[PDB]
Amino acid sequence: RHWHTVVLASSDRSLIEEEGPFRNFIQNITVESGNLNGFFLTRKNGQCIPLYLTAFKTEEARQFKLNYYGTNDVYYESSKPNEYAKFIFYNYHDGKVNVVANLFGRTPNLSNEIKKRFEEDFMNRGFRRENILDISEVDHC
Amino acid sequence: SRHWHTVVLASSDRSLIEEEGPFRNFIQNITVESGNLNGFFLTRKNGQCIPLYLTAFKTEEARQFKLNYYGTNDVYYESSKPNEYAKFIFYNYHDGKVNVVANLFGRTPNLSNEIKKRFEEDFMNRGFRRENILDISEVDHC
Ligand SMILES: CCc1ccc(O)cc1
Ligand SMILES: CCc1ccc(O)cc1
Ligand SMILES: [Cl-]
Ligand SMILES: [Cl-]
Ligand SMILES: [Cl-]
Ligand SMILES: [Cl-]
Ligand SMILES: [Cl-]
Ligand SMILES: [Zn+2]
Numbered sequence: 653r654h655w656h657t658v659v660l661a662s663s664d665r666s667l668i669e670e671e672g673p674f675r676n677f678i679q680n681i682t683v684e685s686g687n688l689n690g691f692f693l694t695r696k697n698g699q700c701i702p703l704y705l706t707a708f709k710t711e712e713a714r715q716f717k718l719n720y721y722g723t724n725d726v727y728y729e730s731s732k733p734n735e736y737a738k739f740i741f742y743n744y745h746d747g748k749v750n751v752v753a754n755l756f757g758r759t760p761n762l763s764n765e766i767k768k769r770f771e772e773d774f775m776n777r778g779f780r781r782e783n784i785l786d787i788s789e790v791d792h793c
Numbered sequence: 794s795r796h797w798h799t800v801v802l803a804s805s806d807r808s809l810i811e812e813e814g815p816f817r818n819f820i821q822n823i824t825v826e827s828g829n830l831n832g833f834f835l836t837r838k839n840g841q842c843i844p845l846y847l848t849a850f851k852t853e854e855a856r857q858f859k860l861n862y863y864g865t866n867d868v869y870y871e872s873s874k875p876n877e878y879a880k881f882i883f884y885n886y887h888d889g890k891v892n893v894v895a896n897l898f899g900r901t902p903n904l905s906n907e908i909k910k911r912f913e914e915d916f917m918n919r920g921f922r923r924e925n926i927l928d929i930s931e932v933d934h935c
């Protein structure tokens with residue numbers, strides 16, 4: 653259940669920048685009744701405050717639904733389930749759609765090969781490198 | 794995997810599915826080859842129904858495809874009744890902007906009110922207005 657946020661990427665960089673709604677750092681994930689109960693940390697007023705969310709299962713495997721900053725269609729992917737986890741969030745807020753990609757590792761960092769693939773996959777969709785934030789190299793919660 | 798009709802279109806940006814919109818295309822058929830989806834659509838251009846052939850390539854994930862059209866697209870297929878209808882959700886990336894276009898296909902020009910109702914409510918439940926849904930089963934199109 654132990655996880656670390658290693659890379660964040662978004663169509664809207666502000667979503668993952670400081671004070672951003674999706675700049676959350678995963679701590680652990682526990683599966684209950686097929687749902688994903690996530691415990692995250694987020695920074696506010698200088699301190700690390702807990703954030704508990706639940707991504708509910710859907711009729712589709714690896715697809716979940718999450719109510720946060722609007723609604724989100726969440727997709728899980730991983731070729732190495734015990735080494736990393738990739739979660740793609742399609743966020744709908746005020747009629748606006750954005751994609752937020754999360755790369756989780758068992759420890760604070762991940763192999764360059766895994767990070768490179770995640771990053772190139774994001775950029776190949778038509779996004780700039782600047783919209784990728786590798787936080788393994790940052791002092792966060 | 795064969796004969797289809799576009800019954801309902803819905804999008805985060807209505808201009809995308811309105812007249813002259815890049816996603817206002819009417820499916821005619823889908824042929825599966827090497828796991829890829831070869832689609833044949835019709836599009837209205839200058840009072841003329843012009844053919845549009847596209848291929849959605851398979852990915853490492855089932856029911857997920859990649860399509861190069863009006864930028865890039867992550868395409869997801871869903872259906873509780875595969876022989877009755879097909880739902881395709883397009884996550885379009887155009888000039889750094891993301892939009893969602895949902896397509897509801899039927900074996901014939903129209904679909905049950907139940908199926909259309911669920912499709913439409915699922916769309917609106919995500920935070921979109923009813924006006925962004927276009928039921929084209931009630932309009933003369935290609
Ligand atoms: C990062 C994916 C996720 C979101 C919410 C949640 O509760 C658990 C996992
Ligand atoms: C509407 C889904 C679809 C897109 C492209 C394609 O080639 C086949 C099906
Ligand atoms: Cl660790
Ligand atoms: Cl630790
Ligand atoms: Cl626009
Ligand atoms: Cl028919
Ligand atoms: Cl027909
Ligand atoms: Zn750790």
Ligand SMILES: [Zn+2]
Pocket residue numbers: 806808809
């Ligand atoms: Zn527009």
Ligand SMILES: [Zn+2]
Pocket residue numbers: 796797798900901902
């Ligand atoms: Zn027909």
